[PDB]
Amino acid sequence: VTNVGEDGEPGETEPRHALSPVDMHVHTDVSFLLDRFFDVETLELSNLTGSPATHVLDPFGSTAQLAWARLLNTCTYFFSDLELSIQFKFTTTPSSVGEGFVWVKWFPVGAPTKTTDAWQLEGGGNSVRIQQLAVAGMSPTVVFKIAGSRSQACGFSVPYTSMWRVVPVFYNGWGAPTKEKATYNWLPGAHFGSILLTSDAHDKGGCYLRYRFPRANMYCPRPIPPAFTRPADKTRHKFPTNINKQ
Amino acid sequence: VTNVGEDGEPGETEPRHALSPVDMHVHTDVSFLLDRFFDVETLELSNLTGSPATHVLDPFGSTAQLAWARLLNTCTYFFSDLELSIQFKFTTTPSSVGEGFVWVKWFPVGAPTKTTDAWQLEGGGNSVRIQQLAVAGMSPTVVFKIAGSRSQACGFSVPYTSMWRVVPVFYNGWGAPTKEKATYNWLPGAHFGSILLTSDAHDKGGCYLRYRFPRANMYCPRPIPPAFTRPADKTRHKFPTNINKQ
Amino acid sequence: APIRVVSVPESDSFMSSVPDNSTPLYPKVVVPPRQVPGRFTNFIDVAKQTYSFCSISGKPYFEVTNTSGDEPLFQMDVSLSAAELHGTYVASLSSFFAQYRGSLNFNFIFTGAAATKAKFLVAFVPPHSAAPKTRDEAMACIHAVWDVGLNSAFSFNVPYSSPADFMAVYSAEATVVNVSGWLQVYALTALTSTDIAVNSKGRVLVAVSAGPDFSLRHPVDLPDKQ
Amino acid sequence: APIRVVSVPESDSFMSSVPDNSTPLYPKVVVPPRQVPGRFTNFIDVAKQTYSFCSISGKPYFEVTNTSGDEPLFQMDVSLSAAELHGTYVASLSSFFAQYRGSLNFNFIFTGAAATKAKFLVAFVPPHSAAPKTRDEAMACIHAVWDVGLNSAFSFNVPYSSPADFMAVYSAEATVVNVSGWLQVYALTALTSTDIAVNSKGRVLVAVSAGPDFSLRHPVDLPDKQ
Amino acid sequence: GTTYCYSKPDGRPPSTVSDPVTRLGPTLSRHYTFKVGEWPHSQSHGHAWICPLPSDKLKKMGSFHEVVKAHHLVKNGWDVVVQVNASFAHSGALCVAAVPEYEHTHEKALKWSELEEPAYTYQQLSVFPHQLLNLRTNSSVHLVMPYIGPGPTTNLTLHNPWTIVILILSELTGPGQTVPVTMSVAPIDAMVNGPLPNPE
Amino acid sequence: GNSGSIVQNFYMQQYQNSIDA
Amino acid sequence: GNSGSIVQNFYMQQYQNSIDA
Amino acid sequence: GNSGSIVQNFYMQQYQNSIDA
Amino acid sequence: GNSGSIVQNFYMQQYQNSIDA
Amino acid sequence: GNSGSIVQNFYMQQYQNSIDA
Known part of the structure; x- marks a missing residue:
């Protein structure tokens, strides 16, 4: 009017x-x-020996009070590539480790996973054994030493390996014919693969996993959850900041 | 004539x-x-734990008997970008530190600032906790190790993030509606942002902050303060120098 | 033949947001065609093409009753940190950034029955000592008269008025770049109905959209919850 | 495929003024248009287009009285470290540099009343055993006769005369590149007035500007105060 | 002679206001005339009358005052003429400058006052747009200043970009009486924003 | 979005990332 | 002023600095 | 197959590999 | 005399040395 | 014989080796 x-x-x-x-x-x-590195996850190293389990790279259903967590939950379907930064921070005395090689193995979506120490290195009596799936081969193996290392890290890029054309961040249905509370918002392979960190350090320290998502594509926007509580009626939230009245 | x-x-x-x-x-x-590095400020590291405060990058109202201090006070409004060099110099025995990671976080003008240790790294019993705002993410996080480091430093470029088209080096008025002696030559956001240095060293040493101001623009020249005292009438100041009569 | 190179002091450091990629270890993967509808490339577009409902006392609306007049029915300070902007898409998207610029579009939808009618005066009050308490006071400001029964919905644009090119997303004790004033809605007339026993009150839903000139800059990391 | 590289010995060092930038970590920020008047790009321009007042005994001027003659009213040695050049823009800007080249322009402004008159002789005396004590001595040098009451203001250029292409900003015990001589002002006649009881003295303000050929090079760091 | 401070005024509306801007015509933002004070023989070089524009005299700016008073932000320049009333037997000289963001004022903020400038300041005040007022040659100074500030507009209640400094370089000598300092101020290309509530 | 080096293509487009069909 | 390497533009002009409007 | 750097030919084709006749 | 690298001009002629008038 | 890098001439032919007359 x-x-x-x-x-x-x-x-x-x-x-x-x-x-x-x-x-x-x-x-x-x-x-x-x-397209930036996000500190998502922190994880423990497995000993060179035994039958370790692989850690799946799935940053999707997070509750973490961090910016990547909500952001990844803003769409219904997602596609992107991946880059990783793995760091290693001592939780004991740095002089405990005199060599400290760390074997990293990345597995594409769908890769077989049972490993047990099987590759023996021999030298002057004593010997060292590494996992069946830690050895360098078909999928990427990265080996870095933590000892004198100026950064106790490694890093590399890996592609989208899922079989789904897009990863469902939300799924109204079951990923398996048996409809178990478990397979509910599920769908197999809705991730980036898995890694296996293995080392004689294992105690002595942990890792720090950062993800970077180059070539991201989001589909079907969804509601964005609040982050802070609701202030009183007719007021404003007041936060500490750079600006603020001294 | x-x-x-x-x-x-x-x-x-x-x-x-x-x-x-x-x-x-x-x-x-x-x-x-x-456009050169200036040693402005020197600062203490915060412990990984607790609720640290961020240090605001504001080289504007200085009194320091240094060339950058007066020079920055030669104009009324200023605009430039920024580059930093952060160094770390021990104040104790260098062998106190066996690893010494230092997390640096830079915050754009206007960024929220409350942090408390919240990200746990686990490894062999013992664990390590870092700040909510030290983690790698939205704004730049830099991590350097001081131990064997050949330079115990880091460095990077950052842009002009203020909301003001120009930073008032002098302001005849108040930056807040309440006119408190405090908010007088003020104006919120007349700076380069803030940083947060965090580390298990914290005692053991301090930093050294150098600023470089690429793309500087100055507006409205102002008087330049003397630097030395006035010599006697009809005389000349006499300073030690390279030249000087042996 | 070996190239003379000088290692910069910031050498072996991390720097999280470097504008460059890591080395690839699993080449040549051709990805399946992803048809799928509704791809979005910029959050500001979904913020502008979409509306959310405000949180007035926990409900998405304010009420007019057959007893109203003077006092403001809805009042919120113009800041993305405002309470009534709490559950909204625009407010929530904003927490990812440090600064904003532009206008907000509010549209009120009267959901009172067809047998019901009322008139509202909506005003944008600039920063001031203290916010008007009655409509005769606020009506000196920028305002619009909404006669329901002419249009059941009404859009009002809260403008951007400031000496700064951007204002803060994260507010605090009032500063010159913290708050931009208040948005108030008054009842020009109380609710009239065909039978006051059947319809005594009507609810106005209030929704927000990012204005055409709205923008967000400076991505920021989430601070401690509060 | 890996490139053969040889690390220079000065490798991991700092070097503060390297002609190169650091790595950027917060890309793509478009900065608001900064209209704002009065931008300056070179300090030498504001030094040349602007004047400051000298510090003669703490005041910005020298005086002539109805009793004067012979002796010099103003005397300063030609060096940026001179006392009377103390509070000036040109002197103060200079402390940022090691060397200077060129002339200085001095202009005297007679502020004695309109009913007052006097004549001055201003001389540029080159380096010498010891500076003239009377004007009949100095008048053998480069000089100008300023009759107030012809022009109330008078500009005099102190030239650059030296075997070196630049001289030192920071003076010390006299060297061949330290001092360039003296600037003196004498009273050719004492102040005359319409009534000596009303106007017995008049003040000449003395201001300095960088000359057209003036320049400064070699930025230097500030030494201990003195 | 007219001195333009930094540049000539413009009538461009603020880039940062998406709300209606009202251009006050000349007949609305008129012109006001004040006596700044009296320059005496006792006052010494370095002494200055500080006149931030306007803020302590806004209440005496009639029409302009009424309009500005009712709105939140204002962008505008000024046209000022400072004069002095002295005889041809008076000696002395002032330096009247227009300073952007002047500060010292010990928070007697936005109030016209008197202070003693600190030497390097009176020596170098000429570095700002100004004009010398030598009592043997002239009696007036005319300065025209454009809007200036960190942002495209301001709130005159909290900020006074321009402040006029009338400073004594050569003390007053000659006939015993004082020399009154006078000033005319006219807001120029004034633009006003966002109307405030009714004052009930 | 966020790759600004001249050296971002040190490795071919098919080695560095995935390829859409 | 003070950037003299041929490699000063190793990162694009929009990544390295800010951009005026 | 599996060499994707622009620098894969830092050494000539006859130095880096064998050559078929 | 004695500068034989292709990289001797990694820094511009005005940054690397002095300039004659 | 046995120099196969593209960088074998990082230093000029007169700096790297001797020159025949």
């Missing part, structure tokens, strides 16, 4: 002159936001 | 032949002068 300004008639609104651009919406770009 | 030389008439001045260029005024160029 009437539309634009200053007569005050019913339905009439005053003039507004829209602002000019400046930032160009570059920062709200989906793939820009996800 | 008469103008040029040798008749000695009232108002007449003798001939002067201006000198030819040589240096081309390159060194008095504003952005050239500011």
Whole structure:
């Protein structure tokens, strides 16, 4: 009704002159936001010996009070590639480790996983045994030493290996014919694969896993959960900040 | 009157032949002068644990008897980008530190700041906890080890993040509606952001912050304060120098 | 033949957001065609093309009754940290960033019965000593008269007015870049009905969208909950 | 395939002024348009287009009285470290550099009343055993006669005369590149007035500007205060 | 002679307000005339009358005052003429400058006052747009200043970009009486934003 | 989005990332 | 002013610095 | 098959591998 | 005299040395 | 004979070896 300004008639609104651009919406770009390293997960090393289990790279159903957790939960289907940074931080005395090789093995979505120490290295009496699936071969094996290491880390890029054209972040159905409470929001292979960290350190320290998601694509936006509580009616939340009145 | 030389008439001045260029005024160029690392500030590391406060990068109202301090006070409004060099110098025995990771986090102008240890790393019994805001994510996290480090430093470039089109080095007014002696030459966000240095070293040593200001622009020149005292009438200041009569 | 190289001091460090990729170890994987509808590339677009309902006292609406007048029915300070903007998409998306710029579009939807009618005055009050308490006070400001029964829905744009090019997403004790004023809605007339025993009150749903000039910059990490 | 590289010995060192940038960690920030008047790009321009007042005994001027003659009213040695150049922009800007080249422009402004008059002789005396004590001595040098009451202001250029292409900003015990001589101002006649009881003295303000050929090179760090 | 401070004024509306901007015409933002104070023989070089614009005299700016008072933000320049009333037997000189973001004022913020400038400041005040007022040559200074500030507009209640500094370089000598300092101020290209509530 | 080095293609487009069909 | 390497643009102009509007 | 760097030919084709006749 | 690398001009001629007038 | 890098001429032919007359 009437539309634009200053007569005050019913339905009439005053003039507004829209602002000019400046930032160009570059920062709200989906793939820009996800192409950075995020500290998601922290994990323990397995001993060289025994029958270790692989850790699945699935950052999807998180509750973590971190920016990547909510963000990954903003869409229904997701596709992206992956980059990893694995670091190693001592939890004991750094002089406990004189060599400290760490074998990292990455497995594509669908890879077989049973391993037991099976590859023997021999030298002057004593010997060392590594896992059947830690050896360098078909899938990537990375070996880094923690001892004098200036960064006690490694890192590499890996692609989207799932069989699904897109990863369902939410799934209204079951991933298996038997409909068990377990296979509910499920679907097999809705992830990035799995890794196996193995080392004579294992005690002595842990890791720090960071994910970077290059080439991200999101489908079907979903509601974004709050993050903070609701302040009192008619008030404003007040947070500590850079700006703030001294 | 008469103008040029040798008749000695009232108002007449003798001939002067201006000198030819040589240096081309390159060194008095504003952005050239500011694009170099300056040792401004020195600061303490926070422990990995607790609720640390962030240090705001504001080199503007300085009194320091250093060249960057006066220079930054030569204009009314300033704009430039930023580069940092953070170093770490032991104040105890270098052998106290066997690993010494230092987490650096930079925050853009306006970023929320409350942190408490919240990310646990686990390994062989013992565990390590880092701040909520030290983790790698949305804003830059840099991690360097001090132990064997050949330079115990890190460094990176960051842009102008303020919301003001220009930073007022001087402000005749208040930055908040409540006019408190505090908010007087103020204006929120007239800076480069803030950093958070966090480490198991914290005691054991400190840092050394150097700023470099690429792309500097200065507006409205202001008076430049003296630096030295006034010598006696009709004399000259005499300083130790490279040249000086042996 | 070996190239003279000088190792920078920031050498073996991490730096999380480097503009460069890591080395690839599992090449040549061709990914299946992903048809699938509804891909979005920028969060600002879904914020602009979509509306959420506000949280007025925990409900997505305010009420007018047959007894109203003077006092404001809805009042919220213009800051993304405002309470009534709590459950919204725009407010929630904002927590990922440090600064915002632009307008917010609010649209009120009167859901009172067809046999019901009322008129509202909605005002945008700029920063001031203290917020008006009655409508005769606020009506001096930018305002619009909404006569339901002309249009059941009404859109009002809260403008961006500030000396700064961007304002803070995360508010705190009032600063010059913290708050932009207040949005208030008054009842120009109380609810009238065909039978007050059947319809005594009507609810106005209030929804928010990002305005056409709205923008968000500076991604930030989540601080301790509060 | 891995490239043969040889690490230089100065390898992991710092070197503060390297002509190169650090690695960027927070890309793509478009900065708001900064209109704002009065941007300056080179300090030498503001030094040349601007004047400051000297510090003659703590005041920005020297005085002539109805009793003057012979002796010099103003005397300063030509060195940026001179006392009377103390509070000036040109002197203060100079402390950031090691060497200077060029002329200085001094302009005297007679602020004595309109009913007042006097004549000055201003001389540039080159390095010498010891500085003239009377004007008949100095008048053998480069000088100008300023009759107030012809022009109330008078500009005089102190030239650059030296075998070196640049001289030192930071002076010390006299060297061949330390000092360039003296600037003196004498009273050719004492102040005359319409009534000596009303106006007995008049003050000449003395201001300095960088000359057209003036320049500064070699940025230097500030030494211990003195 | 007219001195433009940094640049000439513009009538461009603030880039940062998406709400209606009202351009006050000349007949609305008129012109106001004040006596700044009296320059005496006792006052010494370095002494300055500090006149932030306007803020302690906004209440005496009639029309402009009424309009500004009712709105939140204002962008505008000023046209000021400072004069002095002295005889041809008076000696002395002032330096009247227009300073952006002037501060010292010990938080007697936005109040016209008197202070003693600190030497390097009075010596170098000429580095800001100014004009010398030598009592043997002239009696007026005319400065025109554009809007200036960290952002495209401000709130005059909390910020006064421009402040006029009238400083004594050469003390007053000659006839015993004082020299009154006078000033005309006219808001220029004033633009106003966001109307405030009714004052009940 | 977020790859700004001239050296981002040190490895071919088919080795560095996946390829859409 | 003070960037003289041929490698000063190893990272794009929009990644290395800010950009004026 | 499996050599994707632009630098895979840092050494000439006759130095890096064997050559078929 | 004695600078024979292709990389001797890694830094511009005005940064690396002085310049004659 | 036995120099197969593209970088074998990182240093000029007159700096790297001797020159026949």
